[PDB]
Write a protein that binds this DNA or RNA. Structure first.
Ligand SMILES: [Mg+2]
Ligand SMILES: [Mg+2]
Ligand SMILES: [Mg+2]
Ligand SMILES: [Mg+2]
Ligand SMILES: [Mg+2]
Ligand SMILES: [Mg+2]
Ligand SMILES: [Mg+2]
Ligand SMILES: [Mg+2]
Ligand SMILES: [Mg+2]
Ligand SMILES: [Mg+2]
Ligand SMILES: [Mg+2]
Ligand SMILES: [Mg+2]
Ligand SMILES: [Mg+2]
Ligand SMILES: [Mg+2]
Ligand SMILES: [Mg+2]
Ligand SMILES: [Mg+2]
Ligand SMILES: [Mg+2]
Ligand SMILES: [Mg+2]
Ligand SMILES: [Mg+2]
Ligand SMILES: [Mg+2]
Ligand SMILES: [Mg+2]
Ligand SMILES: [Mg+2]
Ligand SMILES: [Mg+2]
Ligand SMILES: [Mg+2]
Ligand SMILES: [Mg+2]
Ligand SMILES: [Mg+2]
Ligand SMILES: [Mg+2]
Ligand SMILES: [Mg+2]
Ligand SMILES: [Mg+2]
Ligand SMILES: [Mg+2]
Ligand SMILES: [Mg+2]
Ligand SMILES: [Mg+2]
Ligand SMILES: [Mg+2]
Ligand SMILES: [Mg+2]
Ligand SMILES: [Mg+2]
Ligand SMILES: [Mg+2]
Ligand SMILES: [Mg+2]
Ligand SMILES: [Mg+2]
Ligand SMILES: [Mg+2]
Ligand SMILES: [Mg+2]
Ligand SMILES: [Mg+2]
Ligand SMILES: [Mg+2]
Ligand SMILES: [Mg+2]
Ligand SMILES: [Mg+2]
Ligand SMILES: [Mg+2]
Ligand SMILES: [Mg+2]
Ligand SMILES: [Mg+2]
Ligand SMILES: [Mg+2]
Ligand SMILES: [Mg+2]
Ligand SMILES: [Mg+2]
Ligand SMILES: [Mg+2]
Ligand SMILES: [Mg+2]
Ligand SMILES: [Mg+2]
Ligand SMILES: [Mg+2]
Ligand SMILES: [Mg+2]
Ligand SMILES: [Mg+2]
Ligand SMILES: [Mg+2]
Ligand SMILES: [Mg+2]
Ligand SMILES: [Mg+2]
Ligand SMILES: [Mg+2]
Ligand SMILES: [Mg+2]
Ligand SMILES: [Mg+2]
Ligand SMILES: [Mg+2]
Ligand SMILES: [Mg+2]
Ligand SMILES: [Mg+2]
Ligand SMILES: [Mg+2]
Ligand SMILES: [Mg+2]
Ligand SMILES: [Mg+2]
Ligand SMILES: [Mg+2]
Ligand SMILES: [Mg+2]
Ligand SMILES: [Mg+2]
Ligand SMILES: [Mg+2]
Ligand SMILES: [Mg+2]
Ligand SMILES: [Mg+2]
Ligand SMILES: [Mg+2]
Ligand SMILES: [Mg+2]
Ligand SMILES: [Mg+2]
Ligand SMILES: [Mg+2]
Ligand SMILES: [Mg+2]
Ligand SMILES: [Mg+2]
Ligand SMILES: [Mg+2]
Ligand SMILES: [Mg+2]
Ligand SMILES: [Mg+2]
Ligand SMILES: [Mg+2]
Ligand SMILES: [Mg+2]
Ligand SMILES: [Mg+2]
Ligand SMILES: [Mg+2]
Ligand SMILES: [Mg+2]
Ligand SMILES: [Mg+2]
Ligand SMILES: [Mg+2]
Ligand SMILES: [Mg+2]
Ligand SMILES: [Mg+2]
Ligand SMILES: [Mg+2]
Ligand SMILES: [Mg+2]
Ligand SMILES: [Mg+2]
Ligand SMILES: [Mg+2]
Ligand SMILES: [Mg+2]
Ligand SMILES: [Mg+2]
Ligand SMILES: [Mg+2]
Ligand SMILES: [Mg+2]
Ligand SMILES: [Mg+2]
Ligand SMILES: [Mg+2]
Ligand SMILES: [Mg+2]
Ligand SMILES: [Mg+2]
Ligand SMILES: [Mg+2]
Ligand SMILES: [Mg+2]
Ligand SMILES: [Mg+2]
Ligand SMILES: [Mg+2]
Ligand SMILES: [Mg+2]
Ligand SMILES: [Mg+2]
Ligand SMILES: [Mg+2]
Ligand SMILES: [Mg+2]
Ligand SMILES: [Mg+2]
Ligand SMILES: [Mg+2]
Ligand SMILES: [Mg+2]
Ligand SMILES: [Mg+2]
Ligand SMILES: [Mg+2]
Ligand SMILES: [Mg+2]
Ligand SMILES: [Mg+2]
Ligand SMILES: [Mg+2]
Ligand SMILES: [Mg+2]
Ligand SMILES: [Mg+2]
Ligand SMILES: [Mg+2]
Ligand SMILES: [Mg+2]
Ligand SMILES: [Mg+2]
Ligand SMILES: [Mg+2]
Ligand SMILES: [Mg+2]
Ligand SMILES: [Mg+2]
Ligand SMILES: [Mg+2]
Ligand SMILES: [Mg+2]
Ligand SMILES: [Mg+2]
Ligand SMILES: [Mg+2]
Ligand SMILES: [Mg+2]
Ligand SMILES: [Mg+2]
Ligand SMILES: [Mg+2]
Ligand SMILES: [Mg+2]
Ligand SMILES: [Mg+2]
Ligand SMILES: [Mg+2]
Ligand SMILES: [Mg+2]
Ligand SMILES: [Mg+2]
Ligand SMILES: [Mg+2]
Ligand SMILES: [Mg+2]
Ligand SMILES: [Mg+2]
Ligand SMILES: [Mg+2]
Ligand SMILES: [Mg+2]
Ligand SMILES: [Mg+2]
Ligand SMILES: [Mg+2]
Ligand SMILES: [Mg+2]
Ligand SMILES: [Mg+2]
Ligand SMILES: [Mg+2]
Ligand SMILES: [Mg+2]
Ligand SMILES: [Mg+2]
Ligand SMILES: [Mg+2]
Ligand SMILES: [Mg+2]
Ligand SMILES: [Mg+2]
Ligand SMILES: [Mg+2]
Ligand SMILES: [Mg+2]
Ligand SMILES: [Mg+2]
Ligand SMILES: [Mg+2]
Ligand SMILES: [Mg+2]
Ligand SMILES: [Mg+2]
Ligand SMILES: [Mg+2]
Ligand SMILES: [Mg+2]
Ligand SMILES: [Mg+2]
Ligand SMILES: [Mg+2]
Ligand SMILES: [Mg+2]
Ligand SMILES: [Mg+2]
Ligand SMILES: [Mg+2]
Ligand SMILES: [Mg+2]
Ligand SMILES: [Mg+2]
Ligand SMILES: [Mg+2]
Ligand SMILES: [Mg+2]
Ligand SMILES: [Mg+2]
Ligand SMILES: [Mg+2]
Ligand SMILES: [Mg+2]
Ligand SMILES: [Mg+2]
Ligand SMILES: [Mg+2]
Ligand SMILES: [Mg+2]
Ligand SMILES: [Mg+2]
Ligand SMILES: [Mg+2]
Ligand SMILES: [Mg+2]
Ligand SMILES: [Mg+2]
Ligand SMILES: [Mg+2]
Ligand SMILES: [Mg+2]
Ligand SMILES: [Mg+2]
Ligand SMILES: [Mg+2]
Ligand SMILES: [Mg+2]
Ligand SMILES: [Mg+2]
Ligand SMILES: [Mg+2]
Ligand SMILES: [Mg+2]
Ligand SMILES: [Mg+2]
Ligand SMILES: [Mg+2]
Ligand SMILES: [Mg+2]
Ligand SMILES: [Mg+2]
Ligand SMILES: [Mg+2]
Ligand SMILES: [Mg+2]
Ligand SMILES: [Mg+2]
Ligand SMILES: [Mg+2]
Ligand SMILES: [Mg+2]
Ligand SMILES: [Mg+2]
Ligand SMILES: [Mg+2]
Ligand SMILES: [Mg+2]
Ligand SMILES: [Mg+2]
Ligand SMILES: [Mg+2]
Ligand SMILES: [Mg+2]
Ligand SMILES: [Mg+2]
Ligand SMILES: [Mg+2]
Ligand SMILES: [Mg+2]
Ligand SMILES: [Mg+2]
Ligand SMILES: [Mg+2]
Ligand SMILES: [Mg+2]
Ligand SMILES: [Mg+2]
Ligand SMILES: [Mg+2]
Ligand SMILES: [Mg+2]
Ligand SMILES: [Mg+2]
Ligand SMILES: [Mg+2]
Ligand SMILES: [Mg+2]
Ligand SMILES: [Mg+2]
Ligand SMILES: [Mg+2]
Ligand SMILES: [Mg+2]
Ligand SMILES: [Mg+2]
Ligand SMILES: [Mg+2]
Ligand SMILES: [Mg+2]
Ligand SMILES: [Mg+2]
Lengths: 115, 143, 200, 64
RNA sequence: UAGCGGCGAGCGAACGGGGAGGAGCCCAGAGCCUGAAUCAGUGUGUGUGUUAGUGGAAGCGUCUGGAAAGGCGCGCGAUACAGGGUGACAGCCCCGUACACAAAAAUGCACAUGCUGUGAGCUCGAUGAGUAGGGCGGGACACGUGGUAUCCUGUCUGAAUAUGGGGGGACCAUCCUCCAAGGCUAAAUACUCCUGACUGACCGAUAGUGAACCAGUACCGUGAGGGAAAGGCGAAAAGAACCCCGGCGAGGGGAGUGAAAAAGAACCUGAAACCGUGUACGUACAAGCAGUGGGAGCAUGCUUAGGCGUGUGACUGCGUACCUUUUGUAUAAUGGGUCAGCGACUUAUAUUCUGUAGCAAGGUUAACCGAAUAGGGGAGCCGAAGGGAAACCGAGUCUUAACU
């Protein structure tokens, strides 16, 4: 029983070249080059789910550190102030509040000033 | 049951190792035979009893003995397979027809392997001391 | 033990032939083996030796900026080779007498539970004509059948040769695959008696 | 084709009841006068093959 | 297995048993009596076969379609539902098939049998000399000169010749067994250039023969020799009359044929690499495996009175390809121009182990006989007992004078 493999291979190559859609030059056209791009893309994607959680924390922390210093307190002292008052609110929201509702935010900086 | 509905017992069939079919296969690229050297090579591996050029065990040890021609043509008749012949007579030609000992066996011996019931007169045949007690305890007289 | 459909006579058949537990593995092995026995296995590709062409190196070992070749016939080249060329082979596999008998005893007893086995008295067509056989199966309410008979009538044989779904084996020539394949099995009282003695 | 026994091995080993192999000891052919009697006595009876070099023996004689 | 063997690698019997098939004669010659039973004429003359052949059953109506064998509904032949064709898949349209039948003729055969021609029976025996054997040297025997029988001989020699001689694995002696030195013999057995039929868990145009095709051709080589590539319009050529542009060209546009002409002969399908034309977005102060997380804008698709898809991706954090081989590779170490196709742990028999199924102190058959995957055939094999170099003894036995 001979097995021609033209139907199955095509379906394998065409699947990867579909993931490589958008890439420059051979990386979108040429299986042998695309297949590398698609693995590398996977590797970077896998690592960047880890880095996304880091980047955003830095982003929020910067926002909070900015919005705190407008009210006369540094980030380091503010967070200790909040921890010592048993405030459980995270960076993600403090950063959201910092941008949107500053009149509210100010109350957290006062709440921190108590400690 | 239909021709389709039949299936084997679980554990009966086990696929088979297929070497050189990608990473996911486990074995794949060097089909479980490592990197380089004589054993990796097609038609590779040394012959039997080869110890890297050290004198082999089957040559450093001395030869002994000689093959007896008499031992080839003598049987050890089991006493359990004794009353399976012709009532209670077991010469040699009678025992040979029962397919207990080979055709080219002149000398033969009844040993104590356990279990006799019927009386058997064992003629023209060498008999063991334990079997002599058994055969006579069952009933039959030797020679 | 087995009632008929035009008599109601108590044919006392043996218990450990027609009343056993269905051992699926055994049956599967015997039927697979039976199938494997049907193969003729007549095929051949030709190895790099058997291909036509010279042993000459097309180009020399070194010097030309090309991949070292030793033969036109090498299986990595086009139009020559097939690495592990098939040789005509025998796929028939051994089945132990007791396993074959055990499988028949297993399958033939499951026909009694499923009611595919229609035991009958004298079963024979009048003259060698399919029209009659086909017409008499309408009353019996059958279509895809294995008509097992002890005394193999030529009249009955000839009259089922053209009928596709009907097959007329002799009681001696029952098979594992056949008994399973056909949707009903019609055995003659003599044939049951012969099969009883054959399987034992 | 059937496997061939390594005959030389078949002439130096013998299969015991359990599965192990008995063999004669080395150092008892020549140069005996310098050897102590105690050695020559201990080398006289047959000896079982070691578990390390059992696999080498089992392969080279596959019938008995 | 026994043996052989730098006793290494390896080589490897026989006796005996089960089967297939069976079959024997003639010469080295003298009585009575006679051509007779045997081979072979040649015949003819039957039976067959082979090389031409003949008949050979029974379907219609609607629906879809270019076309019906299709679907739907009712019939009918079947010793014919093998298979093939026919405008899509046909038991019943056609060719076949089962089956029944054929030969003027030339042949393969199968026995009556007239017979140019050839000795049945019968007894007296004869009963194969440069031979057997030997020395020397080689070879064949499973057996490598070994303690080597047996066989063959190049060379040199040499019996006895049935009161005799050969073999029984150095050799001898007793027993047993055969009768060399001359011939001829069917079957079982091996093979397939070739002729048919039939079959494939064989291939389906880079496969299968090298060769589906005007292939051992083209082409290459002084020559021996090497040796390609290259299949498919459509149901039917109905192969595009006639116009128009062009050089009364190529090539096109119409028109027509067809169900369809991006089925128009560079002709089923028509992928990918590769090269284009048009639409959306981005892109001419910006440094690197070109992506990836983040993300504005713009363009489209939608439900809308929120936004969510899709394409693009300004700006920005991180980020030196894959394979190989290595202590270690972004490595400036190897391999890859790209795509498509093909391209590497197989098969047979033995063997040990694991799983699984059968049956169990038993298990189990081989060739073969069966037309037959049934079922016979247990010849065997393996197991149920081992110890010892071996005789031998044996739930023991070896060691040893004997063993705590
Ligand atoms: Mg296959
Ligand atoms: Mg195929
Ligand atoms: Mg593709
Ligand atoms: Mg792939
Ligand atoms: Mg594509
Ligand atoms: Mg994209
Ligand atoms: Mg994009
Ligand atoms: Mg592409
Ligand atoms: Mg593309
Ligand atoms: Mg594309
Ligand atoms: Mg976090
Ligand atoms: Mg399964
Ligand atoms: Mg499983
Ligand atoms: Mg497993
Ligand atoms: Mg396999
Ligand atoms: Mg693995
Ligand atoms: Mg691994
Ligand atoms: Mg391994
Ligand atoms: Mg390697
Ligand atoms: Mg190495
Ligand atoms: Mg290695
Ligand atoms: Mg090789
Ligand atoms: Mg090698
Ligand atoms: Mg050395
Ligand atoms: Mg020795
Ligand atoms: Mg020795
Ligand atoms: Mg036997
Ligand atoms: Mg070869
Ligand atoms: Mg050559
Ligand atoms: Mg050459
Ligand atoms: Mg180069
Ligand atoms: Mg190249
Ligand atoms: Mg070719
Ligand atoms: Mg080929
Ligand atoms: Mg191939
Ligand atoms: Mg291959
Ligand atoms: Mg097999
Ligand atoms: Mg197999
Ligand atoms: Mg059988
Ligand atoms: Mg069916
Ligand atoms: Mg000594
Ligand atoms: Mg010392
Ligand atoms: Mg000492
Ligand atoms: Mg010592
Ligand atoms: Mg064995
Ligand atoms: Mg054996
Ligand atoms: Mg010898
Ligand atoms: Mg030597
Ligand atoms: Mg040596
Ligand atoms: Mg040889
Ligand atoms: Mg040989
Ligand atoms: Mg050989
Ligand atoms: Mg033999
Ligand atoms: Mg023999
Ligand atoms: Mg005999
Ligand atoms: Mg016979
Ligand atoms: Mg004759
Ligand atoms: Mg004569
Ligand atoms: Mg004469
Ligand atoms: Mg004639
Ligand atoms: Mg004639
Ligand atoms: Mg005829
Ligand atoms: Mg004809
Ligand atoms: Mg006709
Ligand atoms: Mg007809
Ligand atoms: Mg219509
Ligand atoms: Mg219409
Ligand atoms: Mg249709
Ligand atoms: Mg439908
Ligand atoms: Mg119909
Ligand atoms: Mg209907
Ligand atoms: Mg109807
Ligand atoms: Mg009908
Ligand atoms: Mg059919
Ligand atoms: Mg047919
Ligand atoms: Mg037919
Ligand atoms: Mg057709
Ligand atoms: Mg069509
Ligand atoms: Mg067709
Ligand atoms: Mg119809
Ligand atoms: Mg029909
Ligand atoms: Mg019609
Ligand atoms: Mg025919
Ligand atoms: Mg007939
Ligand atoms: Mg005729
Ligand atoms: Mg005529
Ligand atoms: Mg004539
Ligand atoms: Mg004639
Ligand atoms: Mg002829
Ligand atoms: Mg003579
Ligand atoms: Mg003579
Ligand atoms: Mg003469
Ligand atoms: Mg002599
Ligand atoms: Mg001579
Ligand atoms: Mg001589
Ligand atoms: Mg001599
Ligand atoms: Mg001389
Ligand atoms: Mg000499
Ligand atoms: Mg010599
Ligand atoms: Mg030698
Ligand atoms: Mg030789
Ligand atoms: Mg020699
Ligand atoms: Mg000598
Ligand atoms: Mg020797
Ligand atoms: Mg020697
Ligand atoms: Mg002699
Ligand atoms: Mg002889
Ligand atoms: Mg004389
Ligand atoms: Mg004389
Ligand atoms: Mg003699
Ligand atoms: Mg002689
Ligand atoms: Mg003699
Ligand atoms: Mg002798
Ligand atoms: Mg001999
Ligand atoms: Mg005597
Ligand atoms: Mg005699
Ligand atoms: Mg005589
Ligand atoms: Mg001679
Ligand atoms: Mg002769
Ligand atoms: Mg002849
Ligand atoms: Mg004859
Ligand atoms: Mg033939
Ligand atoms: Mg042929
Ligand atoms: Mg095929
Ligand atoms: Mg080709
Ligand atoms: Mg094609
Ligand atoms: Mg092509
Ligand atoms: Mg070629
Ligand atoms: Mg030329
Ligand atoms: Mg051509
Ligand atoms: Mg074409
Ligand atoms: Mg035209
Ligand atoms: Mg013009
Ligand atoms: Mg012109
Ligand atoms: Mg013009
Ligand atoms: Mg012109
Ligand atoms: Mg013109
Ligand atoms: Mg023109
Ligand atoms: Mg024109
Ligand atoms: Mg034209
Ligand atoms: Mg045109
Ligand atoms: Mg046109
Ligand atoms: Mg047109
Ligand atoms: Mg038209
Ligand atoms: Mg039209
Ligand atoms: Mg139309
Ligand atoms: Mg079309
Ligand atoms: Mg179309
Ligand atoms: Mg159209
Ligand atoms: Mg049209
Ligand atoms: Mg058109
Ligand atoms: Mg057009
Ligand atoms: Mg058009
Ligand atoms: Mg089209
Ligand atoms: Mg066109
Ligand atoms: Mg179209
Ligand atoms: Mg078309
Ligand atoms: Mg063309
Ligand atoms: Mg084209
Ligand atoms: Mg085209
Ligand atoms: Mg076509
Ligand atoms: Mg077509
Ligand atoms: Mg086309
Ligand atoms: Mg396209
Ligand atoms: Mg394309
Ligand atoms: Mg491109
Ligand atoms: Mg391009
Ligand atoms: Mg722009
Ligand atoms: Mg733009
Ligand atoms: Mg700009
Ligand atoms: Mg600047
Ligand atoms: Mg710019
Ligand atoms: Mg740059
Ligand atoms: Mg950089
Ligand atoms: Mg990107
Ligand atoms: Mg992205
Ligand atoms: Mg993203
Ligand atoms: Mg946006
Ligand atoms: Mg917009
Ligand atoms: Mg992006
Ligand atoms: Mg800008
Ligand atoms: Mg960035
Ligand atoms: Mg970087
Ligand atoms: Mg790196
Ligand atoms: Mg590499
Ligand atoms: Mg290297
Ligand atoms: Mg290095
Ligand atoms: Mg690195
Ligand atoms: Mg590199
Ligand atoms: Mg570079
Ligand atoms: Mg290097
Ligand atoms: Mg380099
Ligand atoms: Mg390398
Ligand atoms: Mg290197
Ligand atoms: Mg390169
Ligand atoms: Mg392969
Ligand atoms: Mg392997
Ligand atoms: Mg296989
Ligand atoms: Mg065999
Ligand atoms: Mg085996
Ligand atoms: Mg095991
Ligand atoms: Mg196991
Ligand atoms: Mg199990
Ligand atoms: Mg089991
Ligand atoms: Mg059981
Ligand atoms: Mg049991
Ligand atoms: Mg049991
Ligand atoms: Mg027991
Ligand atoms: Mg048994
Ligand atoms: Mg059995
Ligand atoms: Mg026969
Ligand atoms: Mg036969
Ligand atoms: Mg018979
Ligand atoms: Mg028969
Ligand atoms: Mg039969
Ligand atoms: Mg028997
Ligand atoms: Mg049996
Ligand atoms: Mg023993
Ligand atoms: Mg022992
Ligand atoms: Mg003793
Ligand atoms: Mg002793
Ligand atoms: Mg003792
Ligand atoms: Mg004592
Ligand atoms: Mg004692």
């Amino acid at each position: 029983a001979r097995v021609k493999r033209g139907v199955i291979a095509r379906a394998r190559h065409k699947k990867i070249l579909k993931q490589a859609k958008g890439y420059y030059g051979a990386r979108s056209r040429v299986y042998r080059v695309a297949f590398q791009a698609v693995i590398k893309a996977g590797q970077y994607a896998y690592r960047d789910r880890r880095q996304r959680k880091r980047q955003f924390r830095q982003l929020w922390i910067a926002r909070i550190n900015a919005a705190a210093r407008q009210n006369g307190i540094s980030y380091s002292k503010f967070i200790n102030g909040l921890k010592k008052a048993s405030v459980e609110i995270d960076r993600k929201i403090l950063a959201d509040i910092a941008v949107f509702d500053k009149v509210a935010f100010t109350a957290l900086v006062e709440k921190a000033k108590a400690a | 049951m239909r021709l389709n509905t039949l299936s084997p017992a679980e554990g009966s069939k086990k696929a088979g190792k297929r070497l050189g079919r990608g990473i996911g296969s486990g074995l794949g690229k060097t089909g479980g035979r490592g990197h380089k050297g004589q054993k990796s090579r097609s038609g590779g591996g040394v012959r039997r009893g080869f110890e890297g050029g050290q004198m082999p065990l089957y040559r450093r040890l001395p030869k002994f003995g000689f093959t007896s021609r008499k031992a080839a043509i003598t049987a050890e008749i089991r006493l359990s397979d004794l009353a399976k012949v012709e009532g209670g007579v077991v010469d040699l030609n009678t025992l040979k027809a029962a397919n207990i000992i080979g055709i080219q066996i002149e000398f033969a011996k009844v040993i104590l392997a356990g279990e006799v019931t019927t009386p058997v007169t064992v003629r023209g045949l060498r008999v063991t001391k334990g079997a002599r007690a058994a055969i006579e305890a069952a009933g039959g007289k030797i020679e | 033990e087995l009632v008929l459909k035009d008599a109601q006579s108590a044919l006392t058949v043996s218990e450990t032939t027609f009343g056993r537990d269905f051992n699926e593995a055994l049956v599967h092995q015997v039927v697979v083996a039976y199938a494997a026995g049907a193969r003729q296995g007549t095929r051949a590709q030709k190895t790099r030796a058997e291909v036509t062409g010279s042993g000459k190196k097309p180009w020399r070992q070194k010097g030309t900026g090309r991949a070292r070749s030793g033969s036109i016939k090498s299986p990595i080249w086009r139009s020559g080779g097939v690495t592990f060329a098939a040789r005509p082979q025998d796929h028939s596999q051994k089945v132990n007498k007791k396993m074959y008998r055990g499988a028949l005893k297993s399958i033939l007893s499951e026909l009694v539970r499923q009611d595919r086995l229609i035991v009958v008295e004298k079963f024979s067509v009048e003259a060698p004509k399919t029209k009659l056989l086909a017409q008499k199966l309408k009353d019996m309410a059958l279509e895809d059948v294995l008509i097992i008979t002890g005394e193999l009538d030529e009249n009955l044989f000839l009259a089922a040769r053209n009928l596709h779904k009907v097959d007329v084996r002799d009681a001696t020539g029952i098979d594992p695959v056949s008994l399973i394949a056909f949707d009903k099995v019609v055995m003659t009282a003599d044939a049951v008696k012969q099969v009883e003695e054959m399987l034992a | 084709p059937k496997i061939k026994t390594v005959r030389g091995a078949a002439k130096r080993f013998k299969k015991t009841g359990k599965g192990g192999f008995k063999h004669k000891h080395a150092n008892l052919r020549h140069i005996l006068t310098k050897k102590a009697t105690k050695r020559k006595r201990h080398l006289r009876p047959k000896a079982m093959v070691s578990k390390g070099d059992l696999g080498l023996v089992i392969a080279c004689l596959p019938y008995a």
